[PDB]
Amino acid sequence: AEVTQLSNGIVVATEHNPSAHTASVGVVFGSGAANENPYNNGVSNLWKNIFLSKENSAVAAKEGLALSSNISRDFQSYIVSSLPGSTDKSLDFLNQSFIQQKANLLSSSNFEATKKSVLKQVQDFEENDHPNRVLEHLHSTAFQNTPLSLPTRGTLESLENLVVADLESFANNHFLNSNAVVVGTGNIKHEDLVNSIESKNLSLQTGTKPVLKKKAAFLGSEVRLRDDTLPKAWISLAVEGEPVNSPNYFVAKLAAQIFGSYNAFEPASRLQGIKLLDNIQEYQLCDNFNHFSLSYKDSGLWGFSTATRNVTMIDDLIHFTLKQWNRLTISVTDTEVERAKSLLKLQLGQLYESGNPVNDANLLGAEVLIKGSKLSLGEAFKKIDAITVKDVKAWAGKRLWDQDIAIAGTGQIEGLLDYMRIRSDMSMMRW
């Protein structure tokens, strides 16, 4: 279904869907937050809000277009959505407002107003959004002094020094033809999209992006943002995971599905077939947890995030969850693998097969900037079905058994023990 062409440097990829009632086109760059330095951190956040500025978005509304933009560790995207048949105007808007003319957007009183608003967006994120600011400090401590440790939103201290001249430097170095993929999702044909691009000039810059000296490397460490005025405790814990282009990519994803997510206030969440639940329910140890498996270009992270009000029994929560991770190496059963297979296929079919062409454009553009193509959903189901119990035990013994960990936390975390007591739980002396 995915069709990918090449044209003088830029790559065109589409995912046609006749039943859609909305087409979407845009450009996805293969550079993100991991391509900055601790002094220009936050440049890609300013470029996102300049694109969605009031004057820029007022022009788009008259033609009937809506704008979106996303910033990640590896990629950033700029999307224009419109009704089918209006795809010609969306390409025209992208050309003369972001690709070829950035002077009007980068004017004074428009850069000074956007910078004022972003400085407020990160001030309240740093003091109101606790679960998402300990997952950001987990990246900061696990990849310290490496490119994979800078926050995607930037830093408050770093954003007060950025000027308009720093935004032109980043655009000249990264917004290039060799670093870009042109995407189209929804009700739009591959032949029509490529014909429109060649009917115009539609050429980005010519240079190549700079290369990074050092790669990302995991380091076992911890950071503690203790605050005794907050009513809860938020904790994130992870080991080194898998990159995107790995043979164990789906095996690590299936492993996180065995433990899954949990909500204490949902009656149906308390009946899940997870052996961890019967340990943490007699005494209410947590309100919620989720197990993740994040992959990037260089490395990844595998672990869980928790939030609890039972501040006197945090040690019990950590001890029981890590003891269930040990069974992935020694005694994982066949019923647990079959259940996690069915729930992973449903979860994948709800992310790639949603009804939002904007979500599809980000997913499709990011997978082509890394491996030059997109793996279909039918082929991934065949790879998930092939996983066996011996595969899980081999992967867990290599990545989980007796390995270093990274910890982040905030709130009332006096009851969280030291690093060595927690690291002792990654293995059993009885085995």
Partner 1 sequence: GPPSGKTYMGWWGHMGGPKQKGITSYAVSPYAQKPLQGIFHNAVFNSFRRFKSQFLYVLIPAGIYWYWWKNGNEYNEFLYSKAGREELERVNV
Ligand X SMILES: CCCCCCCCCCCCCCCCCC(=O)OC[C@H](COP(=O)([O-])OCC(O)COP(=O)([O-])OC[C@@H](COC(=O)CCCCCCCCCCCCCCCCC)OC(=O)CCCCCCCCCCCCCCCCC)OC(=O)CCCCCCCCCCCCCCCCC
Could you give the CA distance from residue 30 to residue 35 in angstroms, rounded to a whole number? 10
* DSSP character at residue 411: E
Strand-strand pairing, 180-186 and 10-16: parallel
Instruction: Please say which residue, 101 or 132, places its beta carbon nearer to partner 1.
Output: 132
- Which CA distances in Å does 46 have to 27, 163, 172, 204, 236? 17, 10, 15, 20, 28
- Residues 329/390, Cβ–Cβ less than 8 Å: no
Contact partner, 268, from partner 1, ligand X, ligand PEF, none, Cβ < 5-8 Å per class: none
- By CB under 6 A, residue 420 contacts ligand X: no
Instruction: Please say which residue, 7 or 221, places its beta carbon nearer to partner 1.
Output: 221
Instruction: Please say which residue, 214 or 430, places its beta carbon nearer to ligand PEF.
Output: 430
Q: Residue 429 CB, nearest distance to ligand PEF (Å)? A: 5
Question: By CB under 6 A, what part of segment 389-428 binds ligand PEF?
Answer: 424
For residue 25, the SS3 value is strand
Angle subtended by helix axes 111-128 and 43-51, to nearest 10: 120
Q: Residue 428 CB, nearest distance to ligand X (Å)? A: 4
- Residues 24/355, Cβ–Cβ less than 8 Å: no
Question: By CB under 6 A, what part of segment 307-366 binds ligand X?
Answer: 319
- Residues 254/323, Cβ–Cβ less than 8 Å: no
Q: Residue 429 CB, nearest distance to ligand X (Å)? A: 4
Instruction: Please say which residue, 103 or 429, places its beta carbon nearer to ligand PEF.
Output: 429
User: After which residues do gaps appear in the chain, with C to N over 2.5 Å?
Assistant: none
Q: Residue 279 CB, nearest distance to partner 1 (Å)? A: 19
Q: Residue 320 CB, nearest distance to ligand PEF (Å)? A: 17
In the numeric block, which tokens belong to residue 333?
């059963």
- By CB under 6 A, residue 429 contacts ligand X: yes
Strand-strand pairing, 288-295 and 76-82: unpaired
- By CB under 6 A, residue 221 contacts ligand PEF: no
Instruction: Please say which residue, 130 or 297, places its beta carbon nearer to partner 1.
Output: 130
Closest residue by beta carbon to ligand PEF: 424
Length of the chain: 431
Q: Residue 241 CB, nearest distance to partner 1 (Å)? A: 17
Instruction: Please say which residue, 206 or 229, places its beta carbon nearer to partner 1.
Output: 229
Q: Hey, what amino acid is at 218?
A: F
- By CB under 6 A, residue 429 contacts ligand PEF: yes
Which positions touch ligand PEF (CB under 6 A)? Answer: 424, 429
Which positions touch ligand X (CB under 6 A)? Answer: 319, 428-430
